[PDB]
Enzyme design. Sequence first.
Site, PDB file in Angstrom:
ATOM      1  N   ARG A 276     -21.871  18.492  -3.087  1.00  0.00           N
ATOM      2  CA  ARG A 276     -23.329  18.492  -3.178  1.00  0.00           C
ATOM      3  C   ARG A 276     -23.979  17.595  -2.149  1.00  0.00           C
ATOM      4  NH1 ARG A 276     -24.338  17.100  -9.264  1.00  0.00           N
ATOM      5  NH2 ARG A 276     -26.476  17.024  -8.437  1.00  0.00           N
TER       6      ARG A 276
ATOM      7  N   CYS B 118     -28.913   9.905  -7.230  1.00  0.00           N
ATOM      8  CA  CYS B 118     -27.976  10.998  -7.476  1.00  0.00           C
ATOM      9  C   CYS B 118     -28.763  12.279  -7.529  1.00  0.00           C
ATOM     10  CB  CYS B 118     -27.134  10.736  -8.739  1.00  0.00           C
ATOM     11  SG  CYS B 118     -28.134  10.558 -10.197  1.00  0.00           S
TER      12      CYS B 118
END
Length: 280
Positions: A180, A240
């Site tokens: 990611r 995050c």
Amino acid sequence: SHVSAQWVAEALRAPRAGQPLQLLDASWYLPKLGRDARREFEERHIPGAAFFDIDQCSDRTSPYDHMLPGAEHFAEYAGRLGVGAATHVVIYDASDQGLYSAPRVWWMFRAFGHHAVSLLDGGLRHWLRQNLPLSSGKSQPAPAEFRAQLDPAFIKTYEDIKENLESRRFQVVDSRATGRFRGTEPEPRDGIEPGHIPGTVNIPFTDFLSQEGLEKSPEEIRHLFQEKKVDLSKPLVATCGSGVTACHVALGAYLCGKPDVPIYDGSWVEWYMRARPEDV
């Protein structure tokens, strides 16, 4: 304060006067895992536990999920889960990784001024392997009175992150999985591309944890941070996907002697939406 299963098992057998324990299950999952955290709490939880729901205990106006709530809201909610000023809160989750979303709630209690808060090392995963006792059903502890006050230094905003791209006043670590972060695997939110905020360092949250789902030692975590070019003597912020697993970075640094690691609460989902990278 990381506590072991053995610590919690004794705390249950032997309370200490004037200083009650309240276990919270703060399990939370991205939709794609297909898990229902609350139904799973009702299937099994550690005796005495209550379910702390990070999507309910959050800003009521923001379009982003689990943004920090206001202090009054936090106090109301925690109180209704049986946490008072004197309560030693111990938080776990039932994640496959051992702890996943629990650190977020540990961090929230600290941010609202309640320092008597610990994390159950290994979570329900380790508890289950130890053959320790379970209960089930809905769990409603006696309501308590809780006072909260937000220390804003625990939080960084979009603007802060934006201006830091120039000034570099703090380091920024992103705890998402490598895929990611690097933009080679999808973001698991509808509409959001993967990739990262320029100038951030990727330390997947899983790096702070053993094979067995237990937090690594303080020296192992130290070396992890060194091997990643992060200097624990200079300022450090974590980010995050949505402000959840970034709290693992705050925890890891805390256990190394650095309790001041603010979290970019908005995180990648906010960055993607406001900054609109066209990169990936």
